[PDB]
Amino acid sequence: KTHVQLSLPVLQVRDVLVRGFGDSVEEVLSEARQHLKDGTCGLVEVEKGVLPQLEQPYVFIKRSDAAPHGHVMVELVAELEGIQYGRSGETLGVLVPHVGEIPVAYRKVLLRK
Numbered sequence: 762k763t764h765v766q767l768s769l770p771v772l773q774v775r776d777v778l779v780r781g782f783g784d785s786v787e788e789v790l791s792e793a794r795q796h797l798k799d800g801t802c803g804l805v806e807v808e809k810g811v812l813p814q815l816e817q818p819y820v821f822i823k824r825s826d827a828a829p830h831g832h833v834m835v836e837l838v839a840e841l842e843g844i845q846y847g848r849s850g851e852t853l854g855v856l857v858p859h860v861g862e863i864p865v866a867y868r869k870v871l872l873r874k
């Protein structure tokens with residue numbers, strides 16, 4: 762399927778134990794997609810002071826369309842030193858590994874895969 766229905770656990774930035782997916786744009790997009798497949802991916806909502814607490818390169822989910830079965834259609838955009846790899850809509854948040862942190866909420870997304 763070109764799209765997969767996912768429910769992403771929303772984590773508080775100060776709870777996150779593994780603050781990024783790796784060390785290159787290509788690695789973080791690869792790792793994010795693997796973790797999204799494996800159900801081991803969390804979402805942090807972007808506000809003032811969040812991104813400096815996480816590790817670059819960043820992987821964003823961004824709204825790709827204006828929402829089947831309650832799931833917002835999204836795609837992945839990476840960012841490193843202020844350059845984005847991909848072009849998409851509004852940020853829903855930044856992806857991180859999930860290693861058992863307790864979420865505050867779930868975000869239903871339809872991921873372009």
Ligand SMILES: Cn1ccnc1C(=O)C(F)(F)F
Binds near residue numbers: 765793794797873
């Ligand atoms: C290949 N695949 C199967 C299920 N999900 C995938 C992805 O690449 C995804 F985009 F979801 F990360």
